[PDB]
């Protein structure tokens, strides 16, 4: 069995990326070699992508889409691609075309849990609870149907990035024009004070095996890029202190939202507790596996270790 | 200024494809060259190309995926794939990591408007009537909380393909089965009967122009296979002969619809209507452009001529 491991990515999750994969490729159980897609849009391979990785970033690569790469010699392909251009669908359509069986959720199913607008959409017509919210297109004007504090975010970020927290409605236009930086579409939500949030990991093909529910503290303005990868800053909490009914009811909207949205392989859903009150967040197709991340800390809990967790994901994969 | 166009496709549309590229490059104002996908998946360029739109189909092909395509020659390209490999997001998602302009909607648009059950569940959502449906899944047994006729679909069809009326509870198996066919997830709908069909063309890129409602009329037990494609057999009413707050309500719910999704470039937009009530059917991010088809004609209603059409959507793949 040969893997083949891609990272990197034109996305702002692009040093995420890279860090993801230094964990994956130091547990994988089976040979894998990785492949680099440099910032812009270029690939690097064989050594050249080991040395992109010792850097911590990749600025410029070789080789323009579509890569001289031998795609025959590998039983699975794994992108760990997070944001746009990797984890919404695009590297899943040209896997699918390619004929190539590979990790992680098909091309609709990652299109919308990286849309934070249809994923929520989806969501709220199922009966799973969701943050009330509104979309903004860049252009037309901000018609807000609710009161401050609101949390503007691009509709396809991931590691907090174009994301702020907005306290009065005079700094709605700054916050949205900080959010079309990354995406010509973004959401207005309305902020949960105070908050409590719990993250919970599935595995499986449509019907899931969810992991113990965990929880993330911090002492920042919210969950921000620097809290989530600078080490030691975020409390990571597995298992979740709270209510044991309230734990099985994380793990069953998991589980649920997991079916609806037709998620294949794995996703991590972030959850809300405000006051008694359980909302979902949102599905993250490709999550990180940083030494800061959640995803593979909460099935290290549930008696799946590292190396076995990465195996059950290229055998989904194949089925 | 020179279009690529592809067509042909591994999905059940293949032969329908063939027709809407002879629709196409009959009238598109700019020099276009023609790629062909083969229903073995292998690609035909240049002269095997041409050649084989004068077969009807195109069984088999001769460059595995990727093509060594000279993709720099061409400014704007235009995939004419109707239904699975080709307007669900995965031929989008190539070229859109190919960093090629391309006419139509990306990733996520293609594969929620393709999805009969995704985008019907978003659309309800948004407060979009739709008509009384439910899910199921290969191997898993219906549960339909409605009383027959129905209507059962491949949840990935276009053309009518795998689509039965359901009279009795004894037929729905036979019908899922057929289905199953197709896709791995099919939708089973309620019928209306008696039931009056509109469709509305829309142009532009997420806040589109509506072209006028056009009804389509017809003998035969619905608007199945033969009765699209063989001349004829498929009356277009253009304007469609409704009361003057229906036509307008027509518009703004495709329109509304269109924004929602985020559909960029084009899209036919059907609905029912039955007892004065208006349900959307679905969007069609690649319609037709077969000699019997709608789309086309609903435009030049509207004082867009077919070459002025094609004009449009090459050029709105740039904006
Ligand atoms: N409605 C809200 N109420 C309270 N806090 C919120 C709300 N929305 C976002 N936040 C805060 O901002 C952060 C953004 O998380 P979100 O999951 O929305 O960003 P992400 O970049 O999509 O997360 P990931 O990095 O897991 O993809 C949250 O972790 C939370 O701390
Ligand atoms: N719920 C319904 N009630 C009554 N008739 C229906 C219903 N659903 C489908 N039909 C009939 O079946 C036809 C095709 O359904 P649909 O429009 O869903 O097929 P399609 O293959 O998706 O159409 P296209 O060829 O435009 O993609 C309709 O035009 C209509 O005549």
């Not at 984890?87 to 609709?108: H, I, W």
């Not at 890029?225 to 975020?234: D, H, L, Q, W």
């Not at 209510?243 to 991590?268: C, I, N, S």
């Not at 909302?279 to 549930?302: D, H």
Request: proline share 9%.
């Amino acid at each position: 069995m040969r893997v083949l491991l891609i990272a990197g990515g034109v996305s702002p999750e692009h040093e995420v990326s890279l860090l993801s994969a230094e964990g994956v490729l130091r547990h994988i159980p089976f040979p894998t070699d990785l492949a680099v897609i440099a910032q812009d849009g270029r690939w690097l391979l064989g050594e050249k992508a080991l040395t992109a990785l010792e850097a911590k970033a990749a600025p410029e690569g070789e080789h323009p889409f579509p890569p001289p790469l031998s795609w025959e010699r590998y039983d699975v392909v794994f992108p760990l691609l997070h944001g746009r251009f990797g984890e919404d669908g695009t590297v899943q359509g040209f896997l699918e075309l390619l004929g190539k069986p590979y990790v992680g959720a098909g091309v609709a199913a990652s299109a919308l849990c990286m849309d934070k607008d249809l994923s929520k959409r989806v969501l709220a017509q199922a009966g799973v609870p969701v943050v009330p919210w509104v979309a903004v297109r860049k252009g037309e004007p901000p018609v807000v149907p609710f009161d401050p504090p609101f949390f503007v975010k691009p509709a396809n970020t991931g590691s907090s990035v174009g994301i702020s927290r907005v306290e009065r409605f005079q700094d709605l236009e700054a916050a949205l024009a900080l959010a079309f930086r990354y995406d010509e579409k973004a959401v207005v939500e309305k902020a949960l004070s105070p908050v409590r949030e719990l993250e919970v990991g599935v595995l499986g093909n449509v019907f899931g095996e969810a992991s113990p529910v965990g929880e993330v503290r911090y002492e920042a303005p919210f969950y921000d890029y620097e809290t989530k990868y600078t080490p030691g800053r975020a409390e990571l909490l597995i298992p979740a202190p709270l209510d044991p009914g309230t734990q099985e009811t994380v793990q069953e909207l998991a589980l649920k939202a997991y079916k609806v949205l037709g998620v294949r392989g794995m996703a991590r859903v972030d959850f809300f507790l405000a006051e008694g009150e359980l909302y979902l967040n949102e599905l993250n197709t490709i999550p990180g596996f940083t030494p800061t991340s959640m995803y593979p800390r909460l099935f290290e809990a549930g008696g799946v270790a590292y190396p076995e967790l990465l195996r059950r994901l290229v055998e989904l994969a194949l089925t």
